[PDB]
Design an enzyme around this catalytic site. Structure first.
Site, PDB file in Angstrom:
ATOM      1  N   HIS A  48       0.803  -1.225   0.000  1.00 47.32           N
ATOM      2  CA  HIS A  48       0.000   0.000   0.000  1.00 47.32           C
ATOM      3  C   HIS A  48       0.830   1.265   0.000  1.00 47.32           C
ATOM      4  O   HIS A  48       2.050   1.272   0.323  1.00 47.32           O
ATOM      5  CB  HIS A  48      -0.825   0.105   1.323  1.00 47.32           C
ATOM      6  N   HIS A  50       1.395   4.564   1.953  1.00 47.83           N
ATOM      7  CA  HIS A  50       1.161   5.124   3.283  1.00 47.83           C
ATOM      8  C   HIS A  50       1.261   6.627   3.180  1.00 47.83           C
ATOM      9  O   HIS A  50       1.893   7.166   2.255  1.00 47.83           O
ATOM     10  CB  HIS A  50       2.104   4.502   4.322  1.00 47.83           C
ATOM     11  N   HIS A  65      -2.366   3.988   6.066  1.00 51.82           N
ATOM     12  CA  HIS A  65      -2.558   3.943   4.615  1.00 51.82           C
ATOM     13  C   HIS A  65      -3.040   5.337   4.144  1.00 51.82           C
ATOM     14  O   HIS A  65      -3.832   6.012   4.821  1.00 51.82           O
ATOM     15  CB  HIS A  65      -3.633   2.919   4.301  1.00 51.82           C
ATOM     16  N   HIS A  73     -10.475   0.340   4.961  1.00 49.79           N
ATOM     17  CA  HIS A  73      -9.567  -0.460   4.167  1.00 49.79           C
ATOM     18  C   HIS A  73     -10.314  -1.469   3.303  1.00 49.79           C
ATOM     19  O   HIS A  73     -11.301  -2.037   3.736  1.00 49.79           O
ATOM     20  CB  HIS A  73      -8.607  -1.198   5.098  1.00 49.79           C
ATOM     21  N   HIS A  82      -9.113   2.489   0.811  1.00 56.97           N
ATOM     22  CA  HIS A  82      -8.234   3.601   0.921  1.00 56.97           C
ATOM     23  C   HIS A  82      -7.622   3.847  -0.460  1.00 56.97           C
ATOM     24  O   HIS A  82      -7.431   2.907  -1.238  1.00 56.97           O
ATOM     25  CB  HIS A  82      -7.076   3.318   1.861  1.00 56.97           C
ATOM     26  N   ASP A  85      -4.727   1.600  -1.143  1.00 58.08           N
ATOM     27  CA  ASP A  85      -4.862   0.131  -1.145  1.00 58.08           C
ATOM     28  C   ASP A  85      -4.564  -0.525  -2.471  1.00 58.08           C
ATOM     29  O   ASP A  85      -5.382  -0.498  -3.375  1.00 58.08           O
ATOM     30  CB  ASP A  85      -6.251  -0.251  -0.677  1.00 58.08           C
ATOM     31  N   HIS A 122       4.316  -5.551   3.253  1.00 54.56           N
ATOM     32  CA  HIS A 122       4.125  -6.147   4.547  1.00 54.56           C
ATOM     33  C   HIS A 122       4.499  -7.593   4.716  1.00 54.56           C
ATOM     34  O   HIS A 122       4.619  -8.347   3.759  1.00 54.56           O
ATOM     35  CB  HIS A 122       2.650  -5.965   4.971  1.00 54.56           C
ATOM     36  N   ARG A 145       5.999  -4.037   8.684  1.00 62.17           N
ATOM     37  CA  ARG A 145       6.450  -3.351   7.485  1.00 62.17           C
ATOM     38  C   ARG A 145       7.851  -3.882   7.127  1.00 62.17           C
ATOM     39  O   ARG A 145       8.840  -3.572   7.788  1.00 62.17           O
ATOM     40  CB  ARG A 145       6.435  -1.851   7.730  1.00 62.17           C
TER      41      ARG A 145
HETATM   42 CU   LIG Z   1       0.751  -0.850   4.172  1.00 67.15          CU
HETATM   43 ZN   LIG Z   2      -5.796   0.375   3.455  1.00 68.50          ZN
END
Ligand SMILES: [Cu+2]
Ligand SMILES: [Zn+2]
Ligand SMILES: [Cu+2]
Ligand SMILES: [Zn+2]
Lengths: 156, 156
Positions: A48, A50, A65, A73, A82, A85, A122, A145
């Site tokens: 994603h 951020h 995010h 999400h 988001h 996403d 992730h 992360r």
């Molecule tokens: Cu993320």
């Molecule tokens: Zn998200």
């Protein structure tokens, strides 16, 4: 003028690294996302944009995010998601991954611009907000992360 | 809203690393710059904003100095300078360096925004366009690129 290309070099201290390339041929057109990674555990890994392009402190300062539309999400294909996403990157048995997508929510311009923000990959699979956990609707329950990088303007 | 804070983590393969922080109170007001480096050879090192936030090929992919006003290279105090010209970073005998400056040309917003671009610290001293060499008015004849990083948006 309008930004037509961007790039993100992703690194960390978990043996995972990668590069994300973005193209946007018209100011409000879809963005083509291409990513390559190495060093990943086989399977799906949350991916994603951020909010902050701050990678200090091992990706822990990148924020939540990117979510200018103030939604929950979800998966990239969902109406509810988001802006940041991008779903999952799929690593093969060898730990390498190739990802390609066309996205209409992120942009390299305007309010949804990801320029100067962070890309994060992730530890675990992003459940796309379908997992039933509280974190499902916030992070997709994707865990830690592994690597991150700031999104920079690229030559076009 | 307008961007008020930015950060840049600079790295490379030359043993040099650093972090630059930027603050800006108003959309087009002056930007405060604070940078810290380690691993530098004692002396002065050119420090500029390069056009592309692309570090896929070391620092070479960052392109040339950011120059939206289409001027020749100069010192930060000069009327004729690239927007990206931030002079020199001074490293002590221990290889560490601290840099502080307030600049009126770079910005975190608008056409002169450095968000998504690259900060680069060089091998040699920037001659501020006065050295009388082929590259003086182009790069300050600062030589190679020791470390660099993309400029990201930071939490206000
Ligand atoms: Cu993320
Ligand atoms: Zn998200
Ligand atoms: Cu430079
Ligand atoms: Zn210059």
């Amino acid at each position: 003028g309008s930004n037509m290309k961007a790039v993100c070099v992703m690194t960390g201290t978990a043996g995972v690294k990668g590069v994300v390339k973005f193209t946007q041929e018209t100011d409000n057109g879809p963005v083509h996302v291409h990513a390559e990674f190495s060093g990943l555990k086989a399977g799906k890994h949350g991916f994603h944009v951020h909010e902050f392009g701050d990678t200090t402190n091992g990706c822990t300062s990148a924020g939540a995010h990117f979510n200018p539309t103030k939604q929950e999400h979800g998966a990239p294909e969902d109406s509810i998601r988001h802006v940041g996403d991008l779903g999952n990157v799929v690593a093969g048995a060898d730990g390498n991954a190739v990802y390609n997508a066309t996205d209409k929510l992120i942009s390299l311009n305007g309010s949804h611009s990801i320029i100067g923000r962070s890309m994060v990959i992730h530890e675990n699979e992003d459940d796309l907000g379908r997992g039933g956990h509280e974190l499902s609707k916030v992070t997709g329950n994707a865990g830690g992360r592994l690597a991150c990088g700031v999104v920079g303007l690229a030559a076009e």
